[PDB]
Design an enzyme around this catalytic site. Structure first.
Site, PDB file in Angstrom:
ATOM      1  N   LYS B 110       0.836  -1.192   0.000  1.00  0.00           N
ATOM      2  CA  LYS B 110       0.000   0.000   0.000  1.00  0.00           C
ATOM      3  C   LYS B 110       0.871   1.242   0.000  1.00  0.00           C
ATOM      4  O   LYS B 110       1.807   1.356   0.787  1.00  0.00           O
ATOM      5  CB  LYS B 110      -0.956   0.000   1.199  1.00  0.00           C
ATOM      6  N   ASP B 235     -11.278   4.218  13.142  1.00  0.00           N
ATOM      7  CA  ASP B 235     -11.595   4.372  11.720  1.00  0.00           C
ATOM      8  C   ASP B 235     -11.146   3.171  10.902  1.00  0.00           C
ATOM      9  O   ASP B 235     -11.070   3.231   9.674  1.00  0.00           O
ATOM     10  CB  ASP B 235     -10.979   5.654  11.168  1.00  0.00           C
TER      11      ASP B 235
HETATM   12  N1  LIG Z   1      -3.995  -6.188   4.204  1.00  0.00           N
HETATM   13  C1  LIG Z   1      -4.758  -6.313   3.085  1.00  0.00           C
HETATM   14  N2  LIG Z   1      -4.815  -7.456   2.370  1.00  0.00           N
HETATM   15  C2  LIG Z   1      -5.573  -7.577   1.262  1.00  0.00           C
HETATM   16  N3  LIG Z   1      -6.331  -6.589   0.772  1.00  0.00           N
HETATM   17  C3  LIG Z   1      -6.374  -5.387   1.388  1.00  0.00           C
HETATM   18  C4  LIG Z   1      -5.574  -5.175   2.601  1.00  0.00           C
HETATM   19  N4  LIG Z   1      -5.802  -3.907   2.994  1.00  0.00           N
HETATM   20  C5  LIG Z   1      -6.670  -3.352   2.109  1.00  0.00           C
HETATM   21  N5  LIG Z   1      -7.015  -4.245   1.169  1.00  0.00           N
HETATM   22  C6  LIG Z   1      -7.908  -4.001   0.039  1.00  0.00           C
HETATM   23  O1  LIG Z   1      -7.259  -3.090  -0.825  1.00  0.00           O
HETATM   24  C7  LIG Z   1      -8.001  -1.858  -0.875  1.00  0.00           C
HETATM   25  C8  LIG Z   1      -7.371  -0.888   0.091  1.00  0.00           C
HETATM   26  O2  LIG Z   1      -7.284   0.424  -0.450  1.00  0.00           O
HETATM   27  P1  LIG Z   1      -7.726   1.687   0.402  1.00  0.00           P
HETATM   28  O3  LIG Z   1      -9.180   1.552   0.770  1.00  0.00           O
HETATM   29  O4  LIG Z   1      -7.576   2.758  -0.649  1.00  0.00           O
HETATM   30  O5  LIG Z   1      -6.729   1.924   1.511  1.00  0.00           O
HETATM   31  C9  LIG Z   1      -9.431  -2.246  -0.577  1.00  0.00           C
HETATM   32  O6  LIG Z   1     -10.055  -2.735  -1.765  1.00  0.00           O
HETATM   33  C10 LIG Z   1      -9.271  -3.387   0.427  1.00  0.00           C
HETATM   34  O7  LIG Z   1     -10.308  -4.346   0.393  1.00  0.00           O
END
Ligand SMILES: Nc1ncnc2c1ncn2[C@@H]1O[C@H](COP(=O)(O)O)[C@@H](O)[C@H]1O
Ligand SMILES: Nc1ncnc2c1ncn2[C@@H]1O[C@H](COP(=O)(O)O)[C@@H](O)[C@H]1O
Ligand SMILES: Nc1ncnc2c1ncn2[C@@H]1O[C@H](COP(=O)(O)O)[C@@H](O)[C@H]1O
Ligand SMILES: Nc1ncnc2c1ncn2[C@@H]1O[C@H](COP(=O)(O)O)[C@@H](O)[C@H]1O
Lengths: 315, 305
Positions: B110, B235
């Site tokens: 991320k 949050d």
């Molecule tokens: N640790 C994680 N493992 C797998 N998917 C994730 C994880 N954290 C977030 N996501 C997915 O990736 C996206 C996160 O992006 P965001 O909401 O912009 O921070 C969303 O679609 C979540 O469902």
């Protein structure tokens, strides 16, 4: 699991840098041919490790490698595998700046900014000349050039193949040029003193190599020294080391006796400059001869002066 | 064997280079008897300036910063992740789609913000300590590394976590559950895999996990959330994934997975109408919070039978 332990931070940084560059180089495909830019090329890495990994390396240091693609290829042409080379420099600290690697295969000279400039000028020609002789030369084999920065200070280094044997003991060595010289009483005091031209003649020393060898040698020396004048270079030397086989066999015996309380043989694929003395020699000997000091009367002159002298050493 | 660092953008190529470089550098660093306070204030910085060299996939000039490498290497160990595997997963092949996964879907990458990295430093010591105490058994995000890339004078911060979702089993629907008026938006409802929310779940009537799992997973979730609340954080969401077996219909059969890789995975109970569920907490780098815990902790206990 390499710690990079050394007596000085400069040596640690050298070990680190050879390690780091050789690994990077190995994720870099091997080119069909070199390119003109590869001769202007360089890698620069700069480390700041804050409160991390400071047992052996400084927190802060810089490593530059000149023309890393050219020297990789220079290594290949001389029959040195990169992993071997890396290991000789990293498994254990170089020891002596005039450094050797812990295993005595490689020599590590501190040089000057000038020397490094000189390496660049001659580099294009030196490569081609190593190519058309297939690596068969008495010239210095250059394996790597580096600039190290520790505590803000810069150090320039060139790595070469050791002229001397990595295993066999040298009992006496000369530096020869062929000019109208002698080793100082200060030198003569050293355990293994570096003698010079007049010392060589003044003691009647000759090297008995055998004719098939004396010719393979003088033909090398010829191309080599013509190449050097053609490049306008001067003041170089023939390093001449002598290993007495029988005296070493005895030194060994005295070394085994102490602890407790084959002879004349070398791998010509490692001890690349080494010649056995002719069956008829007065002493069973091994010589190591090669040209050194080509970075830094005249050139066309030196060439022939130098060449006549070294031809007279042999029989 | 030869690792080119070919990726879509050059920033991804730096990431590959960087993870490769730091993990190797680390293999020369002894594993200490304990972490020390300085390990939480430490970093590696490396600046590369390559002229007319090695420029096929990498910029000639870039910077790579790794935060608190001794801590994250320990965190990796505590999360049962081998450093060489972690390294291979980032490095063998470019990551795919900011929010990336490594090409083997084992790790998420991320992109985060300056203040996030700040929040991370803020909670690291306590987060480490808690991962220790719960013996790595937690539903919290698993922080594997945090990095700062500098490409074109532009700085980009990244955090690597373990993937919540399986890295092999197709996910057929997923929810994002917190606990106000929040639900899948118009245009969001339209994508290939929609991210429904608490109300799309409740109003979907969706609910089936063994009693043991519901009991042990809730003991997990509670312990975690009381920790997220103690840290005055909130949050955060609960990422849930659903994998329907039939719909998928030598080889790995239906509903088959390695529980040691897919760490959050859970198969349906016999009584269920046949699925694999993926569940763990996400998004915890943002500083009512105490009530946010219980509100969150109960809306969750009522999605499990
Ligand atoms: N640790 C994680 N493992 C797998 N998917 C994730 C994880 N954290 C977030 N996501 C997915 O990736 C996206 C996160 O992006 P965001 O909401 O912009 O921070 C969303 O679609 C979540 O469902
Ligand atoms: N690509 C090059 N071509 C010619 N000379 C160079 C090159 N790179 C460095 N030098 C010379 O080597 C010495 C040290 O260079 P530097 O690496 O900049 O410290 C200086 O005399 C430079 O001019
Ligand atoms: N390639 C080499 N192999 C072994 N010894 C060398 C080499 N080059 C220089 N030396 C040693 O270094 C001394 C002179 O070189 P220097 O003082 O560095 O110019 C001689 O006494 C040699 O023993
Ligand atoms: N086989 C041998 N050849 C040459 N010198 C020897 C030999 N054996 C002993 N010596 C020398 O005789 C002295 C006594 O040596 P050692 O027998 O070790 O006490 C030392 O100078 C040795 O180097």
């Amino acid at each position: 699991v390499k710690l990079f332990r050394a007596s000085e931070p400069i040596l640690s940084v050298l070990m680190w840098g050879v390690n780091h560059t050789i690994n990077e180089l190995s994720n870099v495909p091997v080119p069909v041919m070199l390119m003109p830019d590869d001769f202007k090329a360089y890698s620069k890495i700069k480390v700041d490790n804050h409160l991390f990994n400071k047992e052996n390396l400084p927190s802060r240091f810089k490593f530059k490698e000149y023309c890393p693609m050219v020297f990789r290829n220079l290594r290949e042409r001389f029959g040195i595998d990169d992993q071997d080379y890396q290991n000789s420099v990293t498994r254990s600290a170089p020891i002596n700046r005039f450094l050797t690697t812990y295993d005595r295969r490689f020599v590590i000279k501190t040089v000057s900014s000038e020397d490094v400039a000189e390496m660049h000028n001659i580099l294009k020609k030196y490569h081609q000349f190593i190519v058309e002789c297939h690596g068969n030369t008495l010239l210095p084999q250059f394996l790597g050039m580096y600039r190290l920065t520790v505590d803000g200070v810069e150090t320039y280094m060139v790595v070469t193949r050791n002229v001397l044997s990595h295993r066999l003991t040298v009992h006496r060595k000369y530096d020869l040029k062929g000019s109208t010289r002698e080793a100082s009483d200060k030198e003569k005091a050293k355990d293994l003193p570096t003698f010079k031209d007049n010392d060589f003649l003044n003691e009647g020393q000759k090297l008995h190599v055998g004719e098939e060898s004396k010719k393979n040698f003088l033909e090398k020396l010829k191309r080599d020294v013509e190449f050097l004048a053609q490049l306008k270079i001067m003041d170089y030397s023939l390093l001449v080391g002598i290993h007495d086989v029988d005296r070493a066999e005895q030194e060994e015996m005295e070394v085994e006796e102490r602890a407790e309380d084959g002879p004349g043989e070398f791998d010509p694929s490692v001890d690349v400059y080494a010649m056995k003395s002719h069956e008829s020699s007065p002493k069973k000997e091994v010589y190591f001869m090669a040209i050194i000091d080509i970075l830094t009367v005249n050139p066309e002159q030196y060439s022939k002066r130098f060449n006549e002298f070294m031809s007279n050493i042999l029989t």
